[PDB]
Amino acid sequence: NTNLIVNYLPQDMTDRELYALFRAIGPINTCRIMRDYKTGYSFGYAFVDFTSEMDSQRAIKVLNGITVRNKRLKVSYARPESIKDTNLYVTNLPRTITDDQLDTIFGKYGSIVQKNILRDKLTGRPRGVAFVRYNKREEAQEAISALNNVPLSVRLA
Numbered sequence: 001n002t003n004l005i006v007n008y009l010p011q012d013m014t015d016r017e018l019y020a021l022f023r024a025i026g027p028i029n030t031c032r033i034m035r036d037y038k039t040g041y042s043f044g045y046a047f048v049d050f051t052s053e054m055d056s057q058r059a060i061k062v063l064n065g066i067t068v069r070n071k072r073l074k075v076s077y078a079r080p081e082s083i084k085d086t087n088l089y090v091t092n093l094p095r096t097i098t099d100d101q102l103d104t105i106f107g108k109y110g111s112i113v114q115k116n117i118l119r120d121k122l123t124g125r126p127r128g129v130a131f132v133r134y135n136k137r138e139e140a141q142e143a144i145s146a147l148n149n150v151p152l153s154v155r156l157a
Helices: 015-023 053-063 099-109 137-147
Strands: 003-007 028-035 042-050 074-077 088-091 114-119 126-133 153-156
Touching (some): 015 042, 015 053, 053 074, 099 114, 099 126, 099 137, 137 153
Antiparallel strands (some): 088 126, 088 153
16 A cells, blocks of 8 residues: 555645655656645645555655644555554553563564553553454454453453
């Protein structure tokens, strides 16, 4: 998937100007701002389509979050449950736990699309909790049956 959506475009931005913005990353198939055809009014967003998923992937890392003309951009995917049936909440973990051990534990069940160890604000040491979202609710599911009670508890959001 190469199709991104860009949000919070300054009301006066040009499909051209937007292009220049994203062309810095890689080749684009289409780049288009949603605007009124009679009016020309911009509904504030666009669909940019890179030629490659690994560029589309970089445009996000790079452009999501930049501020041009007082508006804070947001670059994300158009076609990404998958973090709602494919989003696990883990607790009773080792307060000495790190992603390696975490990963060494979850990759066992599938692609680990994102791990998140909740740490202490003040202290920074983690806690026994964290989040791990898979890709297929299926791995997630094989994980939940497997991993509940090493101690440990897994489930969804």
